JSON list of C-alpha atoms in Angstrom, two decimals:
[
{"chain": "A", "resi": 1, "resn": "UNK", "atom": "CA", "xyz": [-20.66, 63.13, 5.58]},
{"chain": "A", "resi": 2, "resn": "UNK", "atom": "CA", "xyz": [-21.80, 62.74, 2.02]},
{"chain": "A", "resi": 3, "resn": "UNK", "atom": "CA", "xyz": [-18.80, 61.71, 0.53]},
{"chain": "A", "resi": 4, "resn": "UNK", "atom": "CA", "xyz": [-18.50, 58.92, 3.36]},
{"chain": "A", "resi": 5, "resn": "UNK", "atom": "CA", "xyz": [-21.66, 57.68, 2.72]},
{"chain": "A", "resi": 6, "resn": "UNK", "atom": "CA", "xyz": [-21.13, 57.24, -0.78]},
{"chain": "A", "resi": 7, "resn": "UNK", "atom": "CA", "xyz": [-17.49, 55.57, 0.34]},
{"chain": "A", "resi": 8, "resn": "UNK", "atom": "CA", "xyz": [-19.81, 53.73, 2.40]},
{"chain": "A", "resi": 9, "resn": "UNK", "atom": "CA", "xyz": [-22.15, 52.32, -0.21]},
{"chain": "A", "resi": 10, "resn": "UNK", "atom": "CA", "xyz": [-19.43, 51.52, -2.20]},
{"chain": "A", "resi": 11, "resn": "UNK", "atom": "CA", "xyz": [-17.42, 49.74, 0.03]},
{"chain": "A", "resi": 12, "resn": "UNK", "atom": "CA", "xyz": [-20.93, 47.42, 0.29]},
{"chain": "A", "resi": 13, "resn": "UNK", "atom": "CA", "xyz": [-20.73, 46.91, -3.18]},
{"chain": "A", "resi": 14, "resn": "UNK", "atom": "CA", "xyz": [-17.31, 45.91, -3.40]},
{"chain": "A", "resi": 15, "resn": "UNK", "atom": "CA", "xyz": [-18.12, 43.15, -0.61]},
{"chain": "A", "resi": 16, "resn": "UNK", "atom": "CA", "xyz": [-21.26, 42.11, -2.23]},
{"chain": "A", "resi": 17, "resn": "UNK", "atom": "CA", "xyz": [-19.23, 41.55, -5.45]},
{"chain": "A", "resi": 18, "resn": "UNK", "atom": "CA", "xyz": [-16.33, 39.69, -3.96]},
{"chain": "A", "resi": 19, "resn": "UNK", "atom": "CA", "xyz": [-19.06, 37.30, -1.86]},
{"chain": "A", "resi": 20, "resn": "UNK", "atom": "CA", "xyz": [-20.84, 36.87, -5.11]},
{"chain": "A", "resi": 21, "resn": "UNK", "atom": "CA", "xyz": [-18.06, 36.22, -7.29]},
{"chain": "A", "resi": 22, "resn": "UNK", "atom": "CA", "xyz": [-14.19, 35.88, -6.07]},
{"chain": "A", "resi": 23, "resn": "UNK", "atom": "CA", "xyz": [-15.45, 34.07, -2.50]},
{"chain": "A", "resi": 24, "resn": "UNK", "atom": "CA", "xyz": [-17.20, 31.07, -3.68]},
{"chain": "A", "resi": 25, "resn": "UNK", "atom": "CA", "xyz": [-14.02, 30.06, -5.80]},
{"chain": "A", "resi": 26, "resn": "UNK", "atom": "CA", "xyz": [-11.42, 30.50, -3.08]},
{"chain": "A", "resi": 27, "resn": "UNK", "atom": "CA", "xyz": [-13.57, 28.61, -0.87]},
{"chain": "A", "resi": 28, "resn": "UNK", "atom": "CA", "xyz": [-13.58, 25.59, -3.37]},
{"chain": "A", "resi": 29, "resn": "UNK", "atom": "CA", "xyz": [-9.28, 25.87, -3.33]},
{"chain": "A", "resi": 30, "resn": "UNK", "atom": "CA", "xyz": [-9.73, 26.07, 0.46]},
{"chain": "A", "resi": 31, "resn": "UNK", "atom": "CA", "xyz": [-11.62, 23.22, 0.59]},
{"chain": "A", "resi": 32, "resn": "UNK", "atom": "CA", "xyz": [-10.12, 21.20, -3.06]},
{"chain": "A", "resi": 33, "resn": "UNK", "atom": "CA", "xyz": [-6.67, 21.50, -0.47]},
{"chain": "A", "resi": 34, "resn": "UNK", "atom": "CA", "xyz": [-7.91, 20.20, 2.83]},
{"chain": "A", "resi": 35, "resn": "UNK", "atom": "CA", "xyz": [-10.15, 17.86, 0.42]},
{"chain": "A", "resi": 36, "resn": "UNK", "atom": "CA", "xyz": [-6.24, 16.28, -0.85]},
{"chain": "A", "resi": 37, "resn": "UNK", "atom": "CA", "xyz": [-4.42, 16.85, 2.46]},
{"chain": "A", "resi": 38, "resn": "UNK", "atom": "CA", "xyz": [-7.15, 14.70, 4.21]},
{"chain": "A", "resi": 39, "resn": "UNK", "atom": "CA", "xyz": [-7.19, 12.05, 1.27]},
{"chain": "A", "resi": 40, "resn": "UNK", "atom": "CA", "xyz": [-3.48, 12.08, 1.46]},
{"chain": "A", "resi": 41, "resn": "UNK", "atom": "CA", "xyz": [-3.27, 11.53, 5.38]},
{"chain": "A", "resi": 42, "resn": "UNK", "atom": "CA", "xyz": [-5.76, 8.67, 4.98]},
{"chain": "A", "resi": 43, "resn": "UNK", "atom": "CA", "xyz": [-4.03, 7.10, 1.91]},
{"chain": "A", "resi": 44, "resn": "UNK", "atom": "CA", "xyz": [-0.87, 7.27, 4.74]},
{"chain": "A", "resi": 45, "resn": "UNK", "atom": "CA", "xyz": [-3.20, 5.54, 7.38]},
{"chain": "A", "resi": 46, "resn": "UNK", "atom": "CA", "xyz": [-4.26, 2.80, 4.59]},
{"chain": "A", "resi": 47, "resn": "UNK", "atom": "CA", "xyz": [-0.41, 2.41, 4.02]},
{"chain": "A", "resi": 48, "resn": "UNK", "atom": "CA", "xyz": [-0.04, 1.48, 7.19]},
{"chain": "A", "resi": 49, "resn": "UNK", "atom": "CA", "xyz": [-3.17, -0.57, 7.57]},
{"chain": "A", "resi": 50, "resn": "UNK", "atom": "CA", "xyz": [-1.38, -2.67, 4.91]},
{"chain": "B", "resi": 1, "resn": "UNK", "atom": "CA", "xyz": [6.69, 15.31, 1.63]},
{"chain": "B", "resi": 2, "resn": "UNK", "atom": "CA", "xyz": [8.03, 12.58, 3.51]},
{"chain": "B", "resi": 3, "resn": "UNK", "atom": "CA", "xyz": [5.32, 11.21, 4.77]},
{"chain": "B", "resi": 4, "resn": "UNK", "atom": "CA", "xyz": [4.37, 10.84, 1.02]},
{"chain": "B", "resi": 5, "resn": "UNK", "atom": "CA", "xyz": [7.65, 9.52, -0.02]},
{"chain": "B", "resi": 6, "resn": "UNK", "atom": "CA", "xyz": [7.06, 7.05, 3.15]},
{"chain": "B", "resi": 7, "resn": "UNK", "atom": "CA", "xyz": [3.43, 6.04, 2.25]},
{"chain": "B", "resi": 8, "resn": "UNK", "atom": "CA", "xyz": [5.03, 5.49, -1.48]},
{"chain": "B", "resi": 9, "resn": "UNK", "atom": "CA", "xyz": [7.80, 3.40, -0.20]},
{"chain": "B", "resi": 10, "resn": "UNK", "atom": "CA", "xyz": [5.84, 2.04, 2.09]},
{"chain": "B", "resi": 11, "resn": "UNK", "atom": "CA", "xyz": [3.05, 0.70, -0.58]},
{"chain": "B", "resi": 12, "resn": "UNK", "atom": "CA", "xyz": [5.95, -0.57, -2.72]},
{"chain": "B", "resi": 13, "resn": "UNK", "atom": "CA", "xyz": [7.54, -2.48, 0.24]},
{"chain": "B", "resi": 14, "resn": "UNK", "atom": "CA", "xyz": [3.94, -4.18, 1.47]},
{"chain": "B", "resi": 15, "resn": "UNK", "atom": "CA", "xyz": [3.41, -5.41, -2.19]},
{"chain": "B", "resi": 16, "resn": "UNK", "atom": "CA", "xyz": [7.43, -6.98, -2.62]},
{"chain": "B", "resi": 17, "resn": "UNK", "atom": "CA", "xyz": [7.08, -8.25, 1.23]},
{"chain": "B", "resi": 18, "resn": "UNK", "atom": "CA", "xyz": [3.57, -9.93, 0.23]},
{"chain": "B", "resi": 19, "resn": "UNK", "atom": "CA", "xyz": [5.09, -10.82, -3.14]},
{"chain": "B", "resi": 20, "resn": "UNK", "atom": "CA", "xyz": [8.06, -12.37, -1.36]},
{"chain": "B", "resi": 21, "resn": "UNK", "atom": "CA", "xyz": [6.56, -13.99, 1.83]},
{"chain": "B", "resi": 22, "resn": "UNK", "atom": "CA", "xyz": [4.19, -16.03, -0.97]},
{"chain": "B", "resi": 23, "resn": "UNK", "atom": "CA", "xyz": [7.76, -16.65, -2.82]},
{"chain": "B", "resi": 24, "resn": "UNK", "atom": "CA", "xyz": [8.99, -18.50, 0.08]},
{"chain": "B", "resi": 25, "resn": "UNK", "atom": "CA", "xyz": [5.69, -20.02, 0.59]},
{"chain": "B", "resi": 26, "resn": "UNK", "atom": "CA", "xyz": [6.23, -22.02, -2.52]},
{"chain": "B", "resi": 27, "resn": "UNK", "atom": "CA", "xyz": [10.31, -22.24, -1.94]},
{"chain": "B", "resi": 28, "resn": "UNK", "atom": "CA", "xyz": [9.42, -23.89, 1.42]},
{"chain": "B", "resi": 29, "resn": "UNK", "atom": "CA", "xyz": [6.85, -26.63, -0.41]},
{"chain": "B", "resi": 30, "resn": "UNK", "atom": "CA", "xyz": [9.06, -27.26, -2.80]},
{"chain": "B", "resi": 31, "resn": "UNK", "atom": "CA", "xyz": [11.96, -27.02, -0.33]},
{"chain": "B", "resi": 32, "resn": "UNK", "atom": "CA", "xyz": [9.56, -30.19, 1.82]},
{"chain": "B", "resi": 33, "resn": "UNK", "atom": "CA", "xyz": [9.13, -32.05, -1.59]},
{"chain": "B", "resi": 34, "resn": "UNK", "atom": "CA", "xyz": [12.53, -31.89, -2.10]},
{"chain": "B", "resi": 35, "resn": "UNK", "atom": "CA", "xyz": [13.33, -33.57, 1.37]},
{"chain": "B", "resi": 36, "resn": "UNK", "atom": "CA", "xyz": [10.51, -35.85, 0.71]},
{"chain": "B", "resi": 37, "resn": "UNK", "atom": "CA", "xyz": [11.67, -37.05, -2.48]},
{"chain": "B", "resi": 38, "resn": "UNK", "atom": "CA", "xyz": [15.65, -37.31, -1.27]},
{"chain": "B", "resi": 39, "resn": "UNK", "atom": "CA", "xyz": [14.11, -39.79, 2.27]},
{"chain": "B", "resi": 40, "resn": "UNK", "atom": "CA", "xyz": [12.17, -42.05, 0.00]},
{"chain": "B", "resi": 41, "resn": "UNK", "atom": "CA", "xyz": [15.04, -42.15, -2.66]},
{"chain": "B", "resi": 42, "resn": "UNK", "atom": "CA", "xyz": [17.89, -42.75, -0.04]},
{"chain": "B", "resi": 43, "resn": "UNK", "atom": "CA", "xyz": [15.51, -45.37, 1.75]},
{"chain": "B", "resi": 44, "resn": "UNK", "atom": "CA", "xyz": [14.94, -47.06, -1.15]},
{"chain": "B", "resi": 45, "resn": "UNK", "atom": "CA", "xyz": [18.83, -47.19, -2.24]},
{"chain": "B", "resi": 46, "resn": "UNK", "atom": "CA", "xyz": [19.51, -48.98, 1.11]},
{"chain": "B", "resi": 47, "resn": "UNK", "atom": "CA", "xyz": [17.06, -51.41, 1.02]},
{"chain": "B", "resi": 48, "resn": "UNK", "atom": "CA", "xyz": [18.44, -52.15, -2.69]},
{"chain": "B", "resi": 49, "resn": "UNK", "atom": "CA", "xyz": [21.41, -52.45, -1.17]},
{"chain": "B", "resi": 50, "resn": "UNK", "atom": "CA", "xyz": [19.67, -54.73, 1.75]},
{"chain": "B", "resi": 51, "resn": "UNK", "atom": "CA", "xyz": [17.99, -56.85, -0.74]},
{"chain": "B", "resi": 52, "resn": "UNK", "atom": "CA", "xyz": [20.93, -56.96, -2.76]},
{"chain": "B", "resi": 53, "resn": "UNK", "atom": "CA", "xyz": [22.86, -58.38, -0.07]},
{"chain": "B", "resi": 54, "resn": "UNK", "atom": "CA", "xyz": [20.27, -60.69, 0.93]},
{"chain": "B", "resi": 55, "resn": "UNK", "atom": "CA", "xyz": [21.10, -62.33, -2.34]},
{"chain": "B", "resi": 56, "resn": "UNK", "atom": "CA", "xyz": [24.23, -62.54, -2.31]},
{"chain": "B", "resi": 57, "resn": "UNK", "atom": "CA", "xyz": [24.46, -64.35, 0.96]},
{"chain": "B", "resi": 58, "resn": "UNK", "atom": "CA", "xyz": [21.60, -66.68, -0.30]},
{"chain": "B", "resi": 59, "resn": "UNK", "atom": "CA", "xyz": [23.24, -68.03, -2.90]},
{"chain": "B", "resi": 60, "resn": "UNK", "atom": "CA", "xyz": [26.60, -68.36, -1.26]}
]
């Protein structure tokens, strides 16, 4: 009970950190690689275009 | 990957084909001067050779 309560509060605290910290910059990679994917698909439809 | 290597290729290719169809552009005006030029110089040559023997049988 009172142990999993404290496991509890700090499993919220290990969330809130990652959110805070660690998820902001994996989203950026996330979107940094559909960001060149998409670039590189419409540098492909340009080629052709050409 | 080979849809890069294609798009690479690809961009190459466009600029050599543009590169080359304005090549023959200029091969084919110079290809039409150079037709031009031979007409009017053979015409020419035979009506030298006309005139030529226009004066020979005048002043026989």
């Amino acid at each position: 009970m009172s142990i999993f309560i404290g496991q509890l509060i700090g499993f919220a605290v290990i969330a809130f950190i990652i959110v805070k910290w660690v998820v902001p910059p994996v989203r950026t990679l996330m979107r940094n690689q559909q960001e060149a994917v998409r670039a590189a698909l419409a540098e492909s439809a340009e080629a052709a275009k050409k | 990957e080979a849809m890069l290597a294609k798009t690479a290729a690809d961009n190459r290719k466009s600029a050599e084909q543009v590169a080359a169809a304005q090549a023959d552009y200029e091969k084919e005006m110079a290809e039409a001067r150079a037709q031009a030029s031979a007409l009017r110089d053979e015409a020419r040559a035979a009506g030298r050779s006309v005139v030529d023997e226009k004066r020979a049988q005048a002043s026989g």
